[PDB]
Amino acid sequence: FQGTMYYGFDIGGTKIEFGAFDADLVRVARERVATPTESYAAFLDAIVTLVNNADAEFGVKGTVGIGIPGIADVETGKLLTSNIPAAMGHTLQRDLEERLQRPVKIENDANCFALSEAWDEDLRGEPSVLGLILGTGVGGGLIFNGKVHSGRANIAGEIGHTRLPYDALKLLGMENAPIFPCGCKNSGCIDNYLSGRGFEQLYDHYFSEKLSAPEIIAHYEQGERRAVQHVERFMELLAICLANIFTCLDPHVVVLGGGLSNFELIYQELPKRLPAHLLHVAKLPKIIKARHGDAGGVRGAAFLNL
Amino acid sequence: GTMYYGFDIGGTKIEFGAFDADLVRVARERVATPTESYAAFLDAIVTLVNNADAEFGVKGTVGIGIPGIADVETGKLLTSNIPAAMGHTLQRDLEERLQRPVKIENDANCFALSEAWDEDLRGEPSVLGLILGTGVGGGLIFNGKVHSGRANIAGEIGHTRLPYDALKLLGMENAPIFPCGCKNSGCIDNYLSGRGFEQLYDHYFSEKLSAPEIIAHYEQGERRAVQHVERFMELLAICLANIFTCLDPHVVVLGGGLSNFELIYQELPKRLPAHLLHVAKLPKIIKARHGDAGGVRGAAFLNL
Ligand SMILES: Nc1ncnc2c1ncn2[C@@H]1O[C@H](COP(=O)(O)OP(=O)(O)NP(=O)(O)O)[C@@H](O)[C@H]1O
Ligand SMILES: Nc1ncnc2c1ncn2[C@@H]1O[C@H](COP(=O)(O)OP(=O)(O)NP(=O)(O)O)[C@@H](O)[C@H]1O
Ligand SMILES: CC(=O)N[C@@H]1[C@@H](O)[C@H](O)[C@@H](CO)O[C@@H]1O
Ligand SMILES: CC(=O)N[C@@H]1[C@@H](O)[C@H](O)[C@@H](CO)O[C@@H]1O
Ligand SMILES: [K+]
Ligand SMILES: [K+]
Ligand SMILES: [Zn+2]
Ligand SMILES: [Zn+2]
Numbered sequence A: 001f002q003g004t005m006y007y008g009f010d011i012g013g014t015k016i017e018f019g020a021f022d023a024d025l026v027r028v029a030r031e032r033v034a035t036p037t038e039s040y041a042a043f044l045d046a047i048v049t050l051v052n053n054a055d056a057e058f059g060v061k062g063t064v065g066i067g068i069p070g071i072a073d074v075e076t077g078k079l080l081t082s083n084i085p086a087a088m089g090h091t092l093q094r095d096l097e098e099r100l101q102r103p104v105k106i107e108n109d110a111n112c113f114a115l116s117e118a119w120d121e122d123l124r125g126e127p128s129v130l131g132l133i134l135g136t137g138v139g140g141g142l143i144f145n146g147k148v149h150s151g152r153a154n155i156a157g158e159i160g161h162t163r164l165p166y167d168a169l170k171l172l173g174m175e176n177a178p179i180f181p182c183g184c185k186n187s188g189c190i191d192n193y194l195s196g197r198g199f200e201q202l203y204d205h206y207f208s209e210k211l212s213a214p215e216i217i218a219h220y221e222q223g224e225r226r227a228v229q230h231v232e233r234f235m236e237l238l239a240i241c242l243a244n245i246f247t248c249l250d251p252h253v254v255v256l257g258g259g260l261s262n263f264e265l266i267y268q269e270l271p272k273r274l275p276a277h278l279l280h281v282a283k284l285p286k287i288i289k290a291r292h293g294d295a296g297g298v299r300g301a302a303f304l305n306l
Numbered sequence B: 001g002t003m004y005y006g007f008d009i010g011g012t013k014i015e016f017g018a019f020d021a022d023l024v025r026v027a028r029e030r031v032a033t034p035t036e037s038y039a040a041f042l043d044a045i046v047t048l049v050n051n052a053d054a055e056f057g058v059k060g061t062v063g064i065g066i067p068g069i070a071d072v073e074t075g076k077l078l079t080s081n082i083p084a085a086m087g088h089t090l091q092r093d094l095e096e097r098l099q100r101p102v103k104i105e106n107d108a109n110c111f112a113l114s115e116a117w118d119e120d121l122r123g124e125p126s127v128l129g130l131i132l133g134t135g136v137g138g139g140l141i142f143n144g145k146v147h148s149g150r151a152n153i154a155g156e157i158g159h160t161r162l163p164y165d166a167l168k169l170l171g172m173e174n175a176p177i178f179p180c181g182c183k184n185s186g187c188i189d190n191y192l193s194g195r196g197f198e199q200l201y202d203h204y205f206s207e208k209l210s211a212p213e214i215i216a217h218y219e220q221g222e223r224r225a226v227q228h229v230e231r232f233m234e235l236l237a238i239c240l241a242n243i244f245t246c247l248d249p250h251v252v253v254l255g256g257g258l259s260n261f262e263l264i265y266q267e268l269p270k271r272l273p274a275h276l277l278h279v280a281k282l283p284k285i286i287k288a289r290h291g292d293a294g295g296v297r298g299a300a301f302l303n304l
C-alpha cells in the first residue's frame, strides 16, 4: 500500500499549484495547471482532475487542502476572491466535497504560507510569526504561539485591505498621491501599493510606462534614473506601511513570500529605514525570506489535514 | 495608430506587451500557457490581441517568440516543452484568426536580439543570449545581427547531448539519462534548465521540490541542497565551457526563471577556467538587463 496521502493546492490568479505528500510528509507530486478564469465549472474540473489522477497514480484517496487568495465567508462558505473571478461568490468547499466524496479544507493563501513557514523547527517556538505575501496582492498570516489566528470571520491578517496611513500619503504628495481603486471595492488599500502589482502601478503612475517589476529592478540595478527614483520611493513607502503594521502587531519574526519577496534589496533596506517610523523603544523583528521558496502555500494547505 | 505587439510564449507563462510608436511599453499582460489543447493555446493569443485592439482602438502588428522552431519549409512547430503546439502551423493559423501578417521567431533569439541592442552591448562582436527556464535556449548575435541558421535551429544548445566530462561528473553509466521532448535523450535541456535543476534534485534525493524551494534550502545551508547546488554549479560550468569552446562569445546574457539564482554569476567565473582552453578569457557574463521583458521586446520589434 501507499498509506495516507496529503494533497495541497495553492490557487492563484494564473496558476494552480498542486502538491502530494506521503505519510512521511515527503513531496511526491508536483503539478501546475492554468487557473480557469471564466467558467467555475472548469475551475472545479481542474481541481477535481488533479485529485483523481493522483488518487489513481498512488492508489489512495488523498486528503484535500486548498489555499486561496481571499476569504471563505465564515457563515455561507461563499468565497470573496477578487483575483479568482471564476470562484467569486461560490461555495467552493461544499462544491468540492460533493464532487470528491470527502472532506475538503479551505484556508487563506497567506495563512497557509504562514502556517508552513512557522512550523519549521527554527520558528515553531517563536511567540509570534507574521507571514507576509507580496505578489499580485498583499496578504498576512498571523501565528501566535504556533497557532493560526484566523479571526472572527476569517479576515485576520487582511493587511492588504487597510488604507494607506497618513505618513505614506505624505510621502506620495498628499492630495496629489495616486489613489488606486481596489478589488475589494474600497479605495487606497495597501494591496495596490506594496504588492509586486503595486510596485508596477506606482512606477507606471509616475513615469507613464507599463514595465514589469523584474524589468524595473533590472533598470534599477543598472542605475537608470527613473528606476532609482522609484525604488527609493518604494523602499520608504514599504518601511512606512510596515512600521504602522508592526506598531500594531509587534511580531517576533516576519517571513516574506510571493513574487516581490525575490527583490533582495528589501532585506537590506527595511532594517535601515524601519527605525525612523517605529516607536523609539521598538526593536526590529527578524525579517527573513521564505524558507520554503514558493512552496509554503501548497505545504500549508496540505498540512491543514495533519 | 502604430502599435507593436510582442508575445513571449513559454512552458508555463505567456507574456504579452504592446509598444507605441515611441517604443514605450503601454500594455503588459500575463496568462498561463494552455499546454494541452491547441484550440486553447490559439485562444489565449487571440484574446490578448483583441482586448488590446479594443482598448487602444487599433490593429497592432504581431510578433511572437515561441520556445521551439517553426519548420523552415512547412511552418509546423517543434516545441519540445509545449505538447499543445507541436506539429501545428502556428503562423498560418493566427494570420487566419487575426486577419493580418504574423512573424514567428524563437524565444531565445528574441531575447538575445533585445539584450544585444542595449547601448552597453551595441558594439560587441558577438552576444550569446542564454535562457534557462522550462528549457535551455540560445540566441546567437554576431555584429548585432541574429544568426538563425539553415533551418531556424541556430542556438538550439538545449538539444545537444551531455558532454563526456558532464557524464563523468554524474557517475558515467550511473548518470541519470533524462528523455527529451525532441524524442532524443540526454539533451542538456533537461539538466541545465530550471526544470532540469529540479529533476536532478529529485533523481538524487527522491523528493519533488521546486527550484526556488531547493534554493531556499540551499540558502539555509541544508545538506542535500548544498550537495545539489555544488553538483549543479559544476555541471553548468562543464556544459557551458564546452559550448564556449565552440562559440567563444564576447558576452553571455542569462534569462528565464533560473537566471534569478544569483549564485550563478559568482560561481561560473570561478569554475569555467578549469574546463576551458588554457588561453581562454572569460566572456562578460551578465543577468538580463530587461528583466523578463527581453523576449517580448524582441518579438514586438521584429515588425520594427
Ligand atoms: N523574481 C521576481 N522579482 C521581482 N518581482 C517579481 C518576481 N517574480 C514575480 N514578481 C512580481 O510579482 C507579481 C506576481 O507575484 P506572484 O507571487 O507570482 O503572484 P500570484 O502567483 O498571482 N499570487 P501568490 O502566489 O499567492 O502570491 C508580479 O508583479 C511580478 O512581476
Ligand atoms: N526566482 C526563481 N529562482 C529560481 N528558479 C526560478 C525562479 N523563477 C522561476 N524559476 C524556475 O524556472 C522554471 C520555469 O521557467 P520560467 O522562465 O519561469 O518559465 P517558462 O515561461 O516556462 N520558461 P521560458 O522559456 O524561460 O520563458 C521552473 O523550474 C521554476 O522553478
Ligand atoms: C479580499 C482579498 O481578495 N484579499 C486577498 C488576500 O486574501 C490575499 O492573502 C492577498 C495576497 O494573495 O491578496 C488579496 O489581498
Ligand atoms: C526544440 C525545442 O523545443 N527547443 C526549445 C528552444 O527553442 C527554447 O529556446 C528553449 C528555451 O525555452 O527550450 C527548448 O529547448
Ligand atoms: K489572512
Ligand atoms: K535559438
Ligand atoms: Zn481593498
Ligand atoms: Zn521546503
Ligand SMILES: [Zn+2]
Pocket: B080, B158, B159, B160, B180, B181, B182, B183, B184, B185, B187, B189
Ligand atoms: Zn532534445
Ligand SMILES: [Zn+2]
Pocket: A215, B289, B290, B291, B293
Ligand atoms: Zn527594459
